[PDB]
Amino acid sequence: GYDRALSIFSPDGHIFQVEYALEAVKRGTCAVGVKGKNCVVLGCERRSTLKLQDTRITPSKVSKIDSHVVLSFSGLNADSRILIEKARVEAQSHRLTLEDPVTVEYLTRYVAGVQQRYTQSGGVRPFGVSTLIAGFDPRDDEPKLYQTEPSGIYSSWSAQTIGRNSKTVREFLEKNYDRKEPPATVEECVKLTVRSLLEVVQTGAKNIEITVVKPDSDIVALSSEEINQYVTQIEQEKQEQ
Amino acid sequence: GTGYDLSNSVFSPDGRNFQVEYAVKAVENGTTSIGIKCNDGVVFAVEKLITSKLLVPQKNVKIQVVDRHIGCVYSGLIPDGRHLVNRGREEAASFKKLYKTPIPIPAFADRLGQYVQAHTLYNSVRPFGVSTIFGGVDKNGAHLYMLEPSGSYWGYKGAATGKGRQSAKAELEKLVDHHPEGLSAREAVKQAAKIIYLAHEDNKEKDFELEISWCSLSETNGLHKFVKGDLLQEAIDFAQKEIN
Amino acid sequence: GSRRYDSRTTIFSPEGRLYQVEYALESISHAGTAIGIMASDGIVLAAERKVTSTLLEQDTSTEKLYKLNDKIAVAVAGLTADAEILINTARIHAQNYLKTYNEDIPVEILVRRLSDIKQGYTQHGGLRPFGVSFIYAGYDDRYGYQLYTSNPSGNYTGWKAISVGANTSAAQTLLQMDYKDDMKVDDAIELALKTLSKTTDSSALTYDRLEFATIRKGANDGEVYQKIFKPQEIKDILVKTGIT
Amino acid sequence: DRGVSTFSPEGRLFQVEYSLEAIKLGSTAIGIATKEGVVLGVEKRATSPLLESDSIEKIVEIDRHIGCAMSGLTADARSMIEHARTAAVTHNLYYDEDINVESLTQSVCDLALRFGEGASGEERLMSRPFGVALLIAGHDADDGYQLFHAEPSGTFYRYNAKAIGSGSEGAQAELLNEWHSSLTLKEAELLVLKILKQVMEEKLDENNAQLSCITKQDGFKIYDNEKTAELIKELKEKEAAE
Amino acid sequence: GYDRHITIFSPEGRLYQVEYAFKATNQTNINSLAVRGKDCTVVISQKKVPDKLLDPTTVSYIFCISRTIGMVVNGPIPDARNAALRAKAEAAEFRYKYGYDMPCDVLAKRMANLSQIYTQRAYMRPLGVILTFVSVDEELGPSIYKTDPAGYYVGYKATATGPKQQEITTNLENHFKKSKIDHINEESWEKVVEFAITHMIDALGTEFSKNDLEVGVATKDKFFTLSAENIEERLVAIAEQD
Amino acid sequence: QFNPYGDNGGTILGIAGEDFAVLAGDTRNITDYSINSRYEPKVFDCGDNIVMSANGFAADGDALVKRFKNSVKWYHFDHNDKKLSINSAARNIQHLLYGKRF
Amino acid sequence: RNNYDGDTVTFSPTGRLFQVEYALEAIKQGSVTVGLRSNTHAVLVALKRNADELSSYQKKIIKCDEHMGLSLAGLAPDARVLSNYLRQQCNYSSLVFNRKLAVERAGHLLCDKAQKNTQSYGGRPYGVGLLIIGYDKSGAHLLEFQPSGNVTELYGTAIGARSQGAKTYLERTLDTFIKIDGNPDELIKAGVEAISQSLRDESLTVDNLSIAIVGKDTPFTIYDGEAVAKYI
Amino acid sequence: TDRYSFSLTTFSPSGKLGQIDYALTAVKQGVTSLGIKATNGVVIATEKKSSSPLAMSETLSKVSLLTPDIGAVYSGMGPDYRVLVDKSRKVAHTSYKRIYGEYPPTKLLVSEVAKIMQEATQSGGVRPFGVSLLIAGHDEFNGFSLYQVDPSGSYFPWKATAIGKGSVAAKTFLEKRWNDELELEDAIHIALLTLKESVEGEFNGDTIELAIIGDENPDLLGYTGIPTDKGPRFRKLTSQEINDRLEA
Amino acid sequence: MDIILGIRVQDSVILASSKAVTRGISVLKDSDDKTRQLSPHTLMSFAGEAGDTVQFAEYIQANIQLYSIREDYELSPQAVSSFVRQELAKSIRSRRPYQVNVLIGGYDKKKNKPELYQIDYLGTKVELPYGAHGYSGFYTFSLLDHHYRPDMTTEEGLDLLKLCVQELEKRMPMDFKGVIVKIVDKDGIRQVDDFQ
Ligand SMILES: [Mg+2]
Ligand SMILES: [Mg+2]
Ligand SMILES: [Mg+2]
Ligand SMILES: [Mg+2]
Ligand SMILES: [Mg+2]
Ligand SMILES: [Mg+2]
Ligand SMILES: [Mg+2]
Ligand SMILES: [Mg+2]
Ligand SMILES: [Mg+2]
Ligand SMILES: [Mg+2]
């Protein structure tokens, strides 16, 4: 029965509950995604502002939606779970009725729509969450990277970041990503991702997690040791010359 | 605290419900209307103000009938009055469908009573902006009731409400004393015309049309009927000469 | 209407926080501290009761430690009554999983649903969040011994050791300094109590003001045992840590 | 404060008035109706240069004979689009015919004031009005080529040419000048570019503005960038001339 | 403080809306009292008819709830009638379901529980009334049970309600301290009425004509009210003891 | 058992000329071996230059004709007094009928 | 000042419903329309309002059945709800009872419909006024509806901006026009004159004038464009 | 139209839930009741507070049978108590007796009451109950027990305690006197003393209400013939039984 | 009914399932697969009334897929079979019951055993070394009872099966157009290239 209208217009034409939702994202940990010639990589920061953290069981920040699409986020973690469950269900249902997995665009469009609905219905507040969604379409090798935000707006990106200090890592990439010559290796593309996080995390692979999505549902998370190589080796280049 | 008057089901600290009190103002502010019990029937009358010459005379009828034997008239917010009658008509139909007999007037008063009182119970609704005068002829004779926005109602010998209510009340008090034996229906009709003309003098500024109806055992047969043609004329005459 | 009385429990502050969650967390900060520590061969749960009279019946009391299942338990900090609602729906979630799949429910799965529940109170329906934080200790065979925490926002996280309620900044620091991974269970027992000795706002730490529990695959057989210590067992363990 | 369906003492719905302020803030959109068709143009307004601007779809198909452009909170429009598509298709299932543009628009506008707190059903309601306006362009055999402006007040107006969004004020004084009966389609394409190039902060190009038209013969089509680029250039030349 | 407008707690642990509802009970300025005989129960209430246009016979704060139960109300008539109707409905439904006539004390309990709910739920307001139920119960003998807007109820040896309630009460307390029993020792109800009117004239310091009162009487297996005439009979009898 | 159907028939005939069309029916209405009426017309003008007949069980036929005409009238309100083309009328009627498929 | 205007369920201390009064103010800001009748016909005349020089003129007249229809002034979507609701009642009367619905009753139904929104939390009231004309079993009729709920039967009237002009003219013209029986065109010319005491800085064109008429042997029909040049 | 689908009890910035606090204040203002647990029994007791001497105080039960083996008493707002008693008796049947064919054990019935109370602390459009209950009972597998239930929904078991006005004083007084070898007669003796401090009016069997959870009473069963059904363990004392004990 | 067989050898589970689909008087197809893979090491075969069989399987499938994604983990064959049984047991007291029978063959990676489960449309589940639905048991159980050893290789299993299909071709009135055979082992699920 509770249908109080919480997302409404104020006189300047703004919707404060939605704008306040973006504030939750800005407080969330940085996430970033960049696309190669044929990988997409998703990287996110951890808080080591606490370190008795059981890292094997604690929820990862990157989530599989189907075997070929992943989703990461910044903002309220509890809220993220609900978008992810809805998406996973939509992906399985889409297979059932159309006999094909979802396109990344479709899945993005779906999630954005959910987000939007929550800015226009009584009794609910918007999601305190912004998302990056990545993967390859079925029988297709051109990589996809999409972004959604609490208002429900979505769009695709050569590369992009969200969360605390996103505007710093956006700078970095705004000038280090060549659209004419995107990262041709996985290794290369993973490197550009770690580089951009290192502007903001400033500890190391303790605090970074990476996940690499490749065509035909080939998805894999890196372990801190192999991430470390990317960190330790970023040092030798900045200093010596 | 303050603002005991903003919400409708709320008691102020002196024990009162200010929104009902404010609804009474909407009524005090309406046009004049009255009821007179004669000794086998009842008579209703009401001042219809004439805004403009563009109104069609005869044709904006403010007295409403319920079932076949009950008349209602009301001062205040007119659409609320109509809403209340629509309810009254459902109530009388339900009662009659089940019990066969047309609804007894007291029974019918309490039906409106309960429904009106009901709109003083909750803040999500607003009290009725009318006082309603009504009645008719049941198997125990004539009954006249009046019903306030609070759901208070009682039986009357006569009753009035709207702007003119005090000149009318004084005038009715006369009739009661100067006719203790009872008043015949046809005389009560003429008196009603007089009383409306007398109560109109609060705002002579506006011209007005008169409307009267009656439910009488001998004269209309216990059914409710409007007064019109010759009998209406004759009662308007009696009202003119009683002014000079 | 009644939207005047609605303090809107599901909205964001201009910083993007949820007022009522933050406030519930504030509430929780004044609750008895609770602690969970995971060893490679078991788990410890320890908690401080709210200063309890001498006349209170400590045998039958169960203010902070609760069995969800033969393999999962929780330590509560916050409103007992709110928690027992949640505990009970969780005991049922476990039973449903067990009945559908004929397999005991994995710890995370349970934790996630219960956290999803709290999250809902935070996004729709205008009710107040549950003023509870939870430490969950459990064993399953996909991840062995596990320790998790959840709070009113709906967020959950996993830990090797953790505290909730009073003085968690302090208590977190002290564990951070003394925890090691090879840690055995009787080491954890000792560490859990050291920490509350330092942490308590009460000047001593005595048996009658504690609740205590362990989850051991110990000893001989691969099965798992849950032990909630009685008053006498806790007194013994306190002597044996020379904290008394 | 005070409920969402309240009137101001001027007799205006607060929430709707504020809705319109959101719309003044959005990218720009322009429509021009002619006898050879109707043209629709939009500012894309990428928010950063990493954004793949193909992905910015402010012009959408509704049926073969009906297209749409939007300015405002554009997320709000996805479900107005859904309703409109569903209405057109539905009409054609019931009547073996294309829906009239007029009717389709009236249908969309009926959503606009269905917002509130109300109770309970029959139907539940949106918490607020939509923060988006639409130009709806089409052809039907009854009234030919047609441009409508459909706002969140529920009203809708036909226009020979119209502009909405952050440009509109001036953009409209400019349309008042330029438009007449006899515009060819091509004249109209260039016009829309002329006016977008003027009011956009950014330097106009085929990646940050997009064009579409609808003709009886070929239906509604969005133009590719290569086709659009070649009209940007075409205009550049006529600018050299005085 | 909105803890003043709805039925929630003040910081002192108080429900002001309940307090203010008690206050409303006195708006009619009517006092009432009830007492018990050997095998009857009597209620007496003032009756004021300020207006000359009222039909006096319609003016009553006493209700025949059932065959056996009478109720008198202290407070405004709309709320009185609402509570009357409700109790009539309850007493009849009880009989249908359980096969016997609803007892006074049980009906009081029920009506009190309904009041209690308005004190706990917010969208419901308390009724501004105090109900005094009387009967001769088949299990309990002549009985009086009183309910208020708090949701409170208790049984009484005798009782009185209204503005001058205090005067009347202390008068009766005194009488029973002397008499040493909890009832009027009288076989006939006509004399228990006489007692009641008498002990009331002395407490209010005021004389009564036959149109100044209402009376109700509960014998075993009937509750009835008196007419001005059966009252007049009583006032004549009282006068024979000057 | 209440049987909710009956048979009044009824014969009707429709022919498409090349710039015209006719629709004809007897005017007789029967039940079992009885005549109810010798003149109870069953072909109706519904007014976008469309004639209709629904032969079979008379009550169901009357309901249908009513409903269709009303459909025509509401097409006007809803689509700017547009004329209802015969093919659109036919589609519309498929929907009215199939509405009662069960 | 004025906590009492927050919704419709709140009376002011003087006894007023501010939200309703604010809805009436939307009407005065609407474009003018005029209604009048003889004993044989009834006529609406309406001044339509465009947005730009590039825009349509918003239609103000809506047909409700063959024998009845109305013009609006104020919140247009609201007229669309009400006129639709009425079309249904006219229709229900035909289908069920085979009876053309009387204008008096349509009056009463609109009143009752509007009244609902003014007693209930959450409902705003309707923000439109209407003139309805019909020819029924007792001849020509004209009604004025206000979103308060009051409907009143008249020989003539006008609502919307500057309508006080057209109304004063009708009060004076009365006995001229009340007798334009069996003459459709005269009665229209007399309506168009009326509507003129109401224009400030623009006069009647083919694009902004719309007119409707109904009566004995003439079904409710609407003229615009070329069709109205006749009388302009 | 219940518009009120939102909580009326919310968290303040300090972490308080005002309405639960205020309910507790109403309780504190209420008349003293108490309970105490012996080895072979439990006693609960309170003061009758006659509002007129014209009222019949016997018709006000402040002490209520919930099941044959379980009783209750309260401090705070009596009406809220009355409807909680109705509710509790019903839930003992619907959610226990109708399923397992035996009456619920004391602690489980307390949970159910607690739960009801919690719901009024969180659901839409209601205030919390303004009472604290002491519930005493016996069941075969837990023996004798005594619980306190608070407006918040929290409960806790006690060897003895008191609620309402004089409760800090009385809790102190009970700590001096309670041992774990108390026999039921002795606990009654103590209950009567502890009450007597907290009251300055007349103090006797008419102004005092008192019940025990003791041995089974077959004289109060109503039927004979089933050796496995022994009477109720719960019993109110008579005006007499009380005065009798006011000798010692 | 169609033919639904299964056998659990030592290191795998073999499912054999008839290829024909017939609608009354014609045989509509002779190459139909009456299985769905539920997860990489769990295979379900099925038979019963038209439409129902597929709808039910594809629904079970999507549910197990959903589970796997959500938990990044593959349910045990025992768990899958309990889930399926419960769904069928809900169907029977439903308004329109699913008339479907299934066999679930899985390799349980955690215990490194193959497992076969037989479940009929009532939700009657049972773990067996070999099973069948409908009349298929009547012809073949004689032979399995005789020849089955728990330590059989996959090759032996396939021989024992060849014999069962021959008995069916000989004694059974219906032409079921051969069988498709699949094997579920520790490395997953594959289809025997040819049952010639
Ligand atoms: Mg699914
Ligand atoms: Mg929703
Ligand atoms: Mg729950
Ligand atoms: Mg489950
Ligand atoms: Mg469809
Ligand atoms: Mg037949
Ligand atoms: Mg003004
Ligand atoms: Mg007995
Ligand atoms: Mg079942
Ligand atoms: Mg069966």
Short mmCIF file of C-alpha atoms in Angstrom, two decimals, chain A:
data_model
loop_
_atom_site.label_atom_id
_atom_site.label_comp_id
_atom_site.label_asym_id
_atom_site.label_seq_id
_atom_site.Cartn_x
_atom_site.Cartn_y
_atom_site.Cartn_z
CA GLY A 1 0.00 0.00 0.00
CA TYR A 2 2.93 2.45 0.41
CA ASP A 3 3.19 4.43 -2.81
CA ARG A 4 4.50 7.83 -1.67
CA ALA A 5 6.11 9.59 -4.58
CA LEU A 6 9.78 10.01 -3.55
CA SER A 7 11.41 10.75 -6.90
CA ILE A 8 9.65 13.99 -7.92
CA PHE A 9 10.67 17.23 -9.73
CA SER A 10 11.91 20.26 -7.82
CA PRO A 11 11.35 23.75 -9.35
CA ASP A 12 14.65 23.96 -11.27
CA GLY A 13 13.64 20.80 -13.10
CA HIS A 14 15.85 18.36 -11.17
CA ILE A 15 14.99 15.12 -9.43
CA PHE A 16 16.81 15.15 -6.18
CA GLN A 17 16.42 11.51 -5.20
CA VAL A 18 18.08 10.54 -8.47
CA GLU A 19 20.85 13.12 -8.18
CA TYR A 20 21.41 11.97 -4.60
CA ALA A 21 21.67 8.43 -5.91
CA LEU A 22 24.67 9.52 -8.08
CA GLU A 23 26.25 10.81 -4.93
CA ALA A 24 26.18 7.23 -3.65
CA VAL A 25 28.03 6.14 -6.76
CA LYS A 26 30.67 8.84 -6.37
CA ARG A 27 31.30 7.41 -2.89
CA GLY A 28 31.58 3.84 -4.26
CA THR A 29 34.87 2.19 -5.19
CA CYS A 30 36.29 2.93 -8.61
CA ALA A 31 35.57 0.59 -11.44
CA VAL A 32 36.82 0.76 -14.94
CA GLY A 33 36.48 -0.96 -18.23
CA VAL A 34 38.41 -0.79 -21.43
CA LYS A 35 38.02 -2.60 -24.67
CA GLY A 36 40.63 -4.13 -26.93
CA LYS A 37 40.71 -5.33 -30.45
CA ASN A 38 39.20 -8.50 -28.90
CA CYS A 39 39.04 -8.55 -25.22
CA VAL A 40 37.28 -6.33 -22.75
CA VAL A 41 38.76 -5.93 -19.35
CA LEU A 42 37.05 -4.95 -16.16
CA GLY A 43 39.06 -3.74 -13.21
CA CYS A 44 37.87 -2.52 -9.82
CA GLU A 45 39.43 -1.29 -6.59
CA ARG A 46 39.05 -2.83 -3.14
CA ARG A 47 39.04 -1.04 0.19
CA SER A 48 41.97 -2.40 2.22
CA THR A 49 40.81 0.19 4.79
CA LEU A 50 40.17 -3.28 6.47
CA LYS A 51 42.38 -6.44 5.98
CA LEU A 52 41.07 -9.49 7.85
CA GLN A 53 38.94 -9.80 4.77
CA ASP A 54 38.27 -13.34 3.54
CA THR A 55 38.82 -12.69 -0.10
CA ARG A 56 37.75 -16.14 -1.45
CA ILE A 57 34.20 -15.94 0.00
CA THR A 58 33.55 -12.15 0.11
CA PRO A 59 31.38 -11.02 -2.82
CA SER A 60 33.34 -10.18 -5.93
CA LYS A 61 32.70 -6.85 -7.57
CA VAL A 62 32.56 -8.37 -11.04
CA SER A 63 29.62 -10.67 -11.73
CA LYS A 64 28.75 -13.11 -14.45
CA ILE A 65 25.29 -12.59 -15.84
CA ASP A 66 25.57 -15.26 -18.49
CA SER A 67 28.65 -17.25 -19.50
CA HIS A 68 29.51 -14.47 -22.07
CA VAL A 69 28.56 -11.21 -20.23
CA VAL A 70 29.78 -9.63 -17.01
CA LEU A 71 28.70 -6.70 -14.96
CA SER A 72 30.49 -4.51 -12.49
CA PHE A 73 29.34 -1.51 -10.45
CA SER A 74 29.93 1.35 -8.04
CA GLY A 75 27.67 2.43 -5.23
CA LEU A 76 25.44 0.61 -2.79
CA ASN A 77 26.43 -3.04 -2.72
CA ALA A 78 23.23 -4.34 -1.38
CA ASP A 79 21.41 -2.53 -4.26
CA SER A 80 23.79 -4.00 -6.85
CA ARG A 81 22.69 -7.52 -5.94
CA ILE A 82 19.18 -6.88 -6.95
CA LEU A 83 20.06 -5.58 -10.38
CA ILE A 84 22.30 -8.61 -10.86
CA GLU A 85 19.68 -11.14 -9.89
CA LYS A 86 17.15 -9.56 -12.23
CA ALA A 87 19.63 -9.53 -15.06
CA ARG A 88 20.65 -13.19 -14.60
CA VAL A 89 17.06 -14.19 -14.67
CA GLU A 90 16.40 -12.10 -17.72
CA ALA A 91 19.35 -13.73 -19.52
CA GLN A 92 18.08 -17.26 -18.84
CA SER A 93 14.58 -16.30 -19.83
CA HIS A 94 15.79 -14.73 -23.05
CA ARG A 95 17.46 -17.98 -23.98
CA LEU A 96 14.24 -19.84 -23.26
CA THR A 97 11.98 -17.72 -25.45
CA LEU A 98 14.24 -16.58 -28.29
CA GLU A 99 16.71 -19.58 -28.26
CA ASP A 100 19.74 -17.29 -28.22
CA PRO A 101 21.73 -15.59 -25.54
CA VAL A 102 21.21 -11.85 -24.97
CA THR A 103 23.20 -9.25 -26.82
CA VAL A 104 25.16 -7.02 -24.47
CA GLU A 105 23.15 -4.07 -25.63
CA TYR A 106 19.89 -5.89 -24.86
CA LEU A 107 20.99 -6.80 -21.36
CA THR A 108 22.16 -3.28 -20.71
CA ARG A 109 18.89 -1.90 -22.02
CA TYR A 110 17.06 -4.20 -19.67
CA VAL A 111 18.96 -3.21 -16.56
CA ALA A 112 18.74 0.49 -17.40
CA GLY A 113 15.02 0.12 -17.71
CA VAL A 114 14.79 -1.37 -14.30
CA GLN A 115 16.79 1.46 -12.89
CA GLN A 116 14.55 3.95 -14.68
CA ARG A 117 11.30 2.39 -13.38
CA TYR A 118 12.60 2.90 -9.87
CA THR A 119 12.88 6.67 -10.59
CA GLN A 120 9.19 6.89 -11.53
CA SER A 121 7.18 4.66 -9.20
CA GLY A 122 5.64 5.27 -5.82
CA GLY A 123 7.03 3.66 -2.69
CA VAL A 124 10.56 3.21 -4.05
CA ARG A 125 13.85 5.03 -4.20
CA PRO A 126 16.23 4.78 -7.16
CA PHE A 127 19.17 2.44 -7.23
CA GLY A 128 22.38 3.82 -5.67
CA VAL A 129 24.33 2.14 -8.38
CA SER A 130 26.08 2.63 -11.68
CA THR A 131 27.16 -0.21 -13.90
CA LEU A 132 29.52 -1.34 -16.53
CA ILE A 133 28.49 -4.29 -18.58
CA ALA A 134 30.89 -6.06 -20.92
CA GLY A 135 31.11 -9.08 -23.18
CA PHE A 136 30.69 -10.37 -26.71
CA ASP A 137 27.52 -10.99 -28.56
CA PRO A 138 26.85 -14.55 -29.73
CA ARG A 139 28.92 -15.64 -32.76
CA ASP A 140 30.52 -12.20 -32.85
CA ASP A 141 34.05 -11.05 -31.92
CA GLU A 142 33.70 -7.20 -31.66
CA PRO A 143 33.83 -6.39 -27.97
CA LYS A 144 31.18 -4.41 -26.11
CA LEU A 145 31.28 -2.10 -23.14
CA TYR A 146 28.20 -0.32 -21.87
CA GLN A 147 27.44 1.99 -18.95
CA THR A 148 24.24 2.51 -16.92
CA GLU A 149 23.34 4.99 -14.22
CA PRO A 150 20.61 5.46 -11.65
CA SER A 151 18.41 7.62 -13.90
CA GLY A 152 18.28 4.75 -16.42
CA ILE A 153 20.48 6.28 -19.14
CA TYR A 154 22.87 3.95 -20.88
CA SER A 155 25.45 4.15 -23.63
CA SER A 156 28.60 2.46 -24.90
CA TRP A 157 32.20 3.43 -24.39
CA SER A 158 35.59 2.69 -25.86
CA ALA A 159 36.57 2.83 -22.22
CA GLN A 160 35.10 4.20 -19.06
CA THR A 161 35.21 4.39 -15.34
CA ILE A 162 32.86 5.13 -12.44
CA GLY A 163 33.12 5.54 -8.68
CA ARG A 164 35.30 7.63 -6.40
CA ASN A 165 37.86 9.55 -8.44
CA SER A 166 36.46 8.27 -11.70
CA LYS A 167 37.13 11.83 -13.13
CA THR A 168 40.89 11.30 -12.53
CA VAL A 169 41.07 7.90 -14.25
CA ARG A 170 38.80 9.26 -16.99
CA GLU A 171 41.40 12.00 -17.64
CA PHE A 172 44.13 9.43 -17.83
CA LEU A 173 42.28 7.30 -20.37
CA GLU A 174 40.84 10.25 -22.24
CA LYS A 175 44.43 10.79 -23.32
CA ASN A 176 45.94 7.27 -23.30
CA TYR A 177 43.33 5.37 -25.34
CA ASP A 178 43.78 5.57 -29.07
CA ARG A 179 40.51 4.75 -30.84
CA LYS A 180 42.48 4.29 -34.08
CA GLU A 181 44.85 1.78 -32.36
CA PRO A 182 43.10 0.14 -29.41
CA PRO A 183 45.13 -2.35 -27.31
CA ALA A 184 45.88 -5.26 -29.66
CA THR A 185 46.86 -7.90 -27.04
CA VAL A 186 45.02 -9.06 -23.99
CA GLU A 187 48.26 -8.43 -22.00
CA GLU A 188 48.34 -4.92 -23.47
CA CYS A 189 44.70 -4.24 -22.66
CA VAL A 190 45.08 -5.60 -19.11
CA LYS A 191 48.10 -3.28 -18.71
CA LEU A 192 46.27 -0.13 -19.76
CA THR A 193 43.57 -1.07 -17.22
CA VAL A 194 45.94 -1.60 -14.30
CA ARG A 195 47.76 1.65 -15.25
CA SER A 196 44.60 3.68 -15.03
CA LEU A 197 43.67 2.28 -11.61
CA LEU A 198 47.13 2.97 -10.25
CA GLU A 199 46.39 6.70 -10.57
CA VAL A 200 43.90 6.20 -7.71
CA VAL A 201 44.43 2.95 -5.74
CA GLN A 202 48.11 3.57 -4.86
CA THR A 203 48.87 0.33 -3.01
CA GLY A 204 48.85 -2.53 -5.53
CA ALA A 205 47.25 -5.87 -6.51
CA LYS A 206 46.22 -6.31 -2.91
CA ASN A 207 43.56 -3.70 -3.76
CA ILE A 208 42.98 -4.43 -7.44
CA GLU A 209 40.95 -7.13 -9.09
CA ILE A 210 40.87 -7.74 -12.84
CA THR A 211 38.66 -9.85 -15.04
CA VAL A 212 39.25 -10.52 -18.74
CA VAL A 213 36.38 -11.35 -21.06
CA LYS A 214 37.19 -12.97 -24.45
CA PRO A 215 34.93 -14.19 -27.33
CA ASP A 216 33.00 -17.50 -27.10
CA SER A 217 32.33 -17.16 -23.39
CA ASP A 218 35.96 -17.26 -22.36
CA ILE A 219 35.91 -15.42 -19.00
CA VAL A 220 38.61 -15.38 -16.32
CA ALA A 221 39.68 -13.45 -13.21
CA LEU A 222 43.38 -12.88 -12.50
CA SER A 223 45.04 -13.91 -9.19
CA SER A 224 46.94 -11.17 -7.36
CA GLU A 225 50.35 -12.71 -8.26
CA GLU A 226 49.77 -12.42 -11.98
CA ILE A 227 48.18 -9.00 -11.44
CA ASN A 228 51.29 -8.12 -9.48
CA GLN A 229 53.45 -8.66 -12.56
CA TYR A 230 51.41 -5.99 -14.29
CA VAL A 231 51.98 -3.69 -11.24
CA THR A 232 55.68 -4.38 -10.54
CA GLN A 233 56.43 -4.05 -14.22
CA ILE A 234 54.52 -0.76 -14.59
CA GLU A 235 57.15 0.72 -12.23
CA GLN A 236 60.06 0.04 -14.71
CA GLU A 237 59.25 2.67 -17.32
CA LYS A 238 58.07 5.53 -15.11
CA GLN A 239 61.36 5.89 -13.28
CA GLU A 240 64.47 4.89 -15.23
CA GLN A 241 63.75 7.09 -18.23
#
